[PDB]
Write a protein that binds this ligand. Structure first.
Ligand SMILES: Nc1ncnc2c1ncn2[C@@H]1O[C@H](COP(=O)(O)OP(=O)(O)O)[C@@H](O)[C@H]1O
Ligand SMILES: Nc1ncnc2c1ncn2[C@@H]1O[C@H](COP(=O)(O)OP(=O)(O)O)[C@@H](O)[C@H]1O
Lengths: 579, 576, 57, 56
């Protein structure tokens, strides 16, 4: 955990790399520029984000990248709260020694991993053992004497657990949020992990993997690549898994194929799925004909509410690159006026999706959350509120809304609003509404709620009246005839397939070599048309759930006779079922 | 020591664990080629006595302990934490550095629940620092060396969720209670170093009898059967206070010893609440077989248990070793999307009259679903633990069902479950089930006694979609009752010479060297059967069992009599 | 398997509710019965044994 | 600060003992001059030149 990593290993965090250069490498090479204004370079950064986003990798790359020249950067790394012992002496004494030896080797980086355990928040009881550590840490990090060129880096899952006196200029003046990688950063991470391989993958395959890995972190992508490689080893040379002696194998023709990555995709569960909220994922390919017609409309509406496709201001992905490629150009009437009139476009982002019971709302919500890739999703659903048994409903709601306030582009998500307004206490809705009306108009905190058979009277003169769902109510109407036709057309395409097409795996004729130790398908188109007509007629004024039920029931019948070439039996069974 | 051949079942995990401990040192070049690192950390979870510690010790002392010796550090979660305020973090750091110096190492945290529990209680702040230091020490993607952290627990949701991520415990292995084949293998393993090894039919019957047993219970059963055999073959060596009456080995462990070992050894599945998964008892089977099979067919239709030609999940190393591979792209995702399109919303609501053997039907159905992940939402399974509230327990049970995809959310006694369980958590469960995708394989099994249908379609359970999947348990028919009351008759027709009574031996125990027909006409049997069926008209399973017990007491009271006229008279008198 | 099953089928649902007038020596009857079943494993469910421990609900 | 707070709640209700007797300030809706200034500021963006807009 010391070396052999650099900044080309890191993918999708190019904005923070520039600032870390600006605080570590740049002062060393150019001390005249910093001393020109009599400023001290910022020292100490608090990395926080979802686990497996690259904080420790970022710190190691900082330590090993700025030391490429003949200016060594010693890297003192401390695990979370591993310094306190059973007595009262060593806890502060060892921190003292750490900072003194950091002073000795003047260009140095102390990395407190999991700093939330070393410096907890001051609770009601058990004060001494952690207060005596926090006080001395505060004393050495911003003492009277010049600490020197010691860059203090802390890493945490959440920053609220660190003492606020640490989150102060001179100690932790910069706080870096490491976000879950988007599609481009995931593409770059996949390219990086599959860079040293002997048989590189194609670019389009990496793009498709990046699309398929929505919700993954960097760590999840690395685990996926490792699992794909392990499956490739298992597929090429299974014999090494049986013998206890080292057989002779060749690191060749062990190229990874798509089938191995697909299997690793089911073997790996992301950190998105471990969470209790709704995992943002695109519309599954089966239901896409049914819903995508009315999902695009929502996107268009969202496009007119959050100004997603109209991004001329607040396009800050990387300030340094902006200064590199773009070019500047009285003062107030050219910056303040236009900035204000650009942020004046978001008034009060709200959206309530309300459809009949079972009309694929769990699907539309996930698709919308996937479209808003750059937004910070906060789930106010019942499961997330009640999952932390120590917290209360009100406390969880306040925590979620306050988290959504920072990281301004964010979405407060309330799936199953009809259940939510019936199982939550009446005062929590009032607290949330007071929080939302205590917001500025130009704030991009979208309130997206999905409800099943919600009465409009409850929104007009009920408890949800003070959320301002006036024009922002979208009705998810039942799917039309053409979408049902496309759904069952895919079903029929499954029906009229030859058994030589349906993938049956194998039965190998010859055993694996030992290693040296060291008919025609009969289906008239008339029957296909009759089955299509019966499916269309049976599902009249049906929702998405009923259509899925009919699809599953018919797919069972079709897959039953997946080898029979005379498909009249499956056809008459299908017709009999729809009666 | 323990090699891999002492472990019954778990061959999937046997193969999957060799790609992170054995192959990495045995084949350093095939892992350095792809620039990959083994996962380095596993979470064993399951019921006690299933073989997590045995897995760890075999894993350490089996993978090439010849020149590249793998050291094994055994620690318990309750052992690390002490009464002081900084002792345990220092102890964890010492343990990890000690494993670092002996680079190929396996640290086994038995019952990691105590060391790092979930963050919902326990102030005084020490456990937060403990969890933080454990999280920071076991970093799996910074090349800390060749330390493999194996954490054992009863249920993984009791472990801190921050530890169940890549770098920390990557793969979770479920150690189930052994099924018939695994119990057979375990019994063969335990009865392999004997001097008179047991037959195959004997072990098959023992595996059939040992229902709801684990590995530890099987070991205790074998040991106690051996002890009883020594007690019986040579009983003179107990009461005699003299010197060694040496005795060679004619000892043969027969049926009459294992059957007492069975009734003396209590399984670890007799401690957990709810219905322990086991088949229908042999007595009540004629009352409930016919209705059970239909249920199985229903469970075989809405879950695709038989026609699982695309989901044959075993050790895929085996699939690769005895199969071979195979536009070429579509054939994967099109047919894969049309393969999960068969599971739409697996729901089932078994509803019958009060006392109609629902505690048997639920257990039999669960025993049918052995390959699933049963998450019990029973009353005693949620109110037993005081560390979590009902809301949190229900949500975590649902989410552990959601993670291990083939799962059954089981709610026995739904009629009680909708009265003593607050409406808030029921609505939370409904919303959780409404947020699942249709192609998710989470079966919602509920067994209710005399539940009202208006509750299902208009009550609080209306949002669970029990609209078409209500299976009605009905009272057993006359033919089934006739077969049920056809073992008492076979107990009325057995003469006292065939009842295993006890008779004192006329001759004393030796010492070694110091170095008619029963009077019962078929008319009486016909009359007894006629009355026994006429009394049990439109009866339930509980009532039929009551009648069966009250008649069995009468039959067994006069078990030495040779003229059953009095017994027949008493039987007719009671059922009148 | 037959004889053990038929001997074990002799207990169906052992229940008993001794009900009498107020103060009719129930506190002695319970003690005498629990002494008669001294080889059993008695689990008291009275109020004094449940609210005694303040940790468990 | 309150919105649509009935004065019945503050001279004879729960808040009547907080002594809000004559210290109730009434925020009325902006008058026509305020709206005119607001929308003149809005319109001044319509009059600005495409080359005048800070488009980097
Ligand atoms: N942005 C990223 N770019 C490249 N690799 C990443 C990125 N984020 C994570 N990784 C990979 O994930 C692995 C583990 O990351 P880790 O330091 O454990 O993150 P965290 O400390 O947040 O859990 C690293 O070895 C790294 O290769
Ligand atoms: N799958 C198995 N095969 C054979 N023996 C087993 C198995 N599981 C457990 N045992 C027996 O039980 C003991 C292991 O107990 P232990 O590992 O402590 O159980 P757990 O890890 O579930 O607490 C061993 O002595 C072993 O003989």
């Amino acid at each position: 955990v010391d070396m052999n990593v650099n900044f080309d290993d890191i993918g999708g965090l190019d904005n923070y790399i520039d600032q870390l250069k600006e605080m570590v490498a740049l002062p060393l090479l150019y001390p005249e520029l910093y001393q020109n204004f009599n400023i001290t370079p910022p020292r100490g950064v608090l990395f926080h984000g979802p686990p497996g986003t690259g904080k420790t990798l970022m710190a190691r790359a900082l330590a090993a990248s700025c030391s490429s020249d003949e200016r060594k950067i010693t890297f003192f790394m401390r695990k979370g709260a591993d310094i306190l012992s059973k007595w009262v002496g060593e806890a502060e004494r060892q921190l003292r020694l750490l900072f003194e030896e950091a002073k000795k080797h003047q260009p140095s980086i102390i990395f407190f991993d999991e700093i939330d355990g070393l410096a907890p928040v001051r609770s009601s009881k058990q004060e001494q053992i952690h207060a005596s550590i926090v006080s001395t840490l505060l004393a050495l990090m911003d003492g009277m004497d010049n600490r020197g060129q010691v860059i203090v880096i802390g890493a945490t899952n959440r920053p609220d657990a660190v003492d606020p006196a640490l989150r102060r200029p001179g100690r932790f003046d910069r706080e870096f949020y490491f976000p879950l990688p988007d599609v481009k950063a995931r593409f770059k991470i996949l390219q990086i992990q599959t860079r040293k391989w002997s048989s590189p993958l194609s670019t389009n395959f990496i793009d498709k993997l990046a699309f398929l890995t929505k919700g993954y972190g960097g760590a999840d992508l690395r685990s996926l690549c490792t699992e794909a490689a392990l499956i490739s080893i298992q597929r090429s040379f299974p014999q090494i898994y049986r013998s206890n002696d080292k057989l002779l194998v060749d690191p060749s023709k062990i190229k990874v194929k798509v089938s191995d990555f697909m299997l690793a995709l089911k073997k790996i569960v992301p950190s998105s799925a471990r969470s209790t909220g709704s995992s943002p994922q695109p519309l599954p390919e089966l239901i896409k004909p049914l819903l995508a017609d009315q999902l695009n409309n929502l996107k268009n509406k969202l496009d007119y509410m959050l100004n997603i496709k109209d991004t001329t201001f607040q396009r800050n992905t990387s300030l340094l690159q902006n200064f590199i490629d773009y070019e500047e150009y009285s003062s107030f009437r050219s910056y303040e006026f236009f900035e204000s009139m650009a942020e004046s476009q978001i008034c009060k982002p709200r959206l309530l999706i309300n459809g009949p019971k079972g009309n694929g709302q769990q699907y539309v919500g996930a698709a919308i959350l996937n479209y808003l890739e750059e937004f910070n999703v906060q789930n106010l659903d019942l499961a997330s509120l009640v999952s932390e048994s120590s917290r209360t409903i009100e406390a969880a709601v306040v925590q979620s809304f306050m988290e959504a306030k920072k990281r301004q582009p964010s979405v407060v998500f309330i799936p199953n609003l009809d259940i939510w307004i019936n199982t939550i206490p009446e005062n929590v809705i009032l607290v949330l509404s007071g929080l939302f009306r205590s917001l500025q108009s130009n704030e991009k905190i979208l309130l997206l709620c999905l409800a099943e058979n919600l009465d409009i009277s409850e929104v007009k003169n009920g408890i949800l009246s003070d959320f301002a769902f006036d024009k922002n109510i979208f009705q998810l109407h039942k799917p039309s005839k053409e979408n049902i036709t496309r759904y069952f057309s895919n079903l029929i395409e499954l029906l009229k397939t030859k058994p030589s097409d349906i993938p049956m795996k194998k039965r190998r004729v010859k055993p694996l070599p030992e290693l040296q130790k060291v008919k025609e398908l009969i289906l008239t188109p008339e029957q296909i048309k009759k089955v299509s007509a019966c499916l269309i007629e049976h599902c009249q004024n049906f929702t998405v759930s009923q259509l899925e039920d009919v699809h599953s029931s018919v797919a069972k019948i079709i897959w039953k006779s997946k080898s029979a070439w005379d498909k009249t039996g499956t056809v008459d069974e299908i017709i009999k079922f729809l009666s």
